[PDB]
Design a binder for this molecule. Structure first.
Ligand SMILES: O=C1Cc2cc(Nc3nc(Cl)ncc3F)ccc2N1
Ligand SMILES: O=C1Cc2cc(Nc3nc(Cl)ncc3F)ccc2N1
Ligand SMILES: [Cl-]
Ligand SMILES: [Cl-]
Lengths: 124, 4, 124, 4
């Protein structure tokens, strides 16, 4: 086509979606990771994670307001990945990289799994 | 704005 | 912080949100622009438009599944702006620029209003 | 990935 494109649009959209999350505006699901609860927007979760895409495209699960993750999932790892979904920034540290990588494999977030593998290989 |  | 950032994340999120819209997945509102209907995600509309942000933060309107726009709004202008929200690309043409600019002023999409004003000034 |  003959379209023009606003370079910062996608980043500005994501920043506003994170502001809605901060302010608990139109959040429509609670993700439970053992004793912790995280509120989010189903559409953002599906856009970022192959696991959430499969969950919320299922005719029965699409209607649930609470999703319980596998008890082996670390809440801090999940929190770091949820922040990444809404900001593009990943708080990867020596003390959390194994939990983050395990959580990203479970959530099916291939680009995160890729950077974790590279950072682990560099330390070996 | 740019030409994509 | 000491975060790393994935450059393409925001664009990839927006591309997936547009794929959900295409496939009518988790759309939760119908916008009516005279005889036409457009399905969308409230969160994307709020993230892009000052008018939708005000509508869906209202305690009564946040619960509506149908929103009727002012009868003066052109459906093609709205369609072009809805595509821009989900893609960052604006199909601006000599034959639609006045309707697009009028619609962006109504929806409170300041960056679009800005490029329309510049393209109009260049033709004068 | 980059240093933001
Ligand atoms: O590593 C990843 C990240 C990821 C996200 C999605 N999300 C969607 N995919 C499509 Cl094709 N349309 C709409 C979507 F919301 C699916 C698989 C995967 N795998
Ligand atoms: O030209 C524009 C585009 C636009 C979008 C929004 N959207 C939101 N603003 C904030 Cl601060 N937090 C969350 C949002 F969804 C508000 C005003 C305006 N004006
Ligand atoms: Cl990813
Ligand atoms: Cl805009």
């Amino acid at each position: 086509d003959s379209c023009i494109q606003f370079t910062r649009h996608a980043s500005d959209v994501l920043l506003n979606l994170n502001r809605l999350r901060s302010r608990d505006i139109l959040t429509d699901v609670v993700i439970v990771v053992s004793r912790e609860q995280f509120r989010a927007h189903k559409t953002v979760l599906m856009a970022c994670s192959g696991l959430f895409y499969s969950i919320f495209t299922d005719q029965l699960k699409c209607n649930l307001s609470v999703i319980n993750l596998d008890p082996e999932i670390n809440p801090e790892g999940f929190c770091i990945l949820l922040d990444f979904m809404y900001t593009s920034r990943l708080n990867l540290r020596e003390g959390n990289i194994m939990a983050v990588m395990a959580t990203a494999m479970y959530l099916q977030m291939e680009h995160v799994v890729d950077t974790c593998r590279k950072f682990i290989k560099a330390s070996e | 704005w740019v030409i994509p």
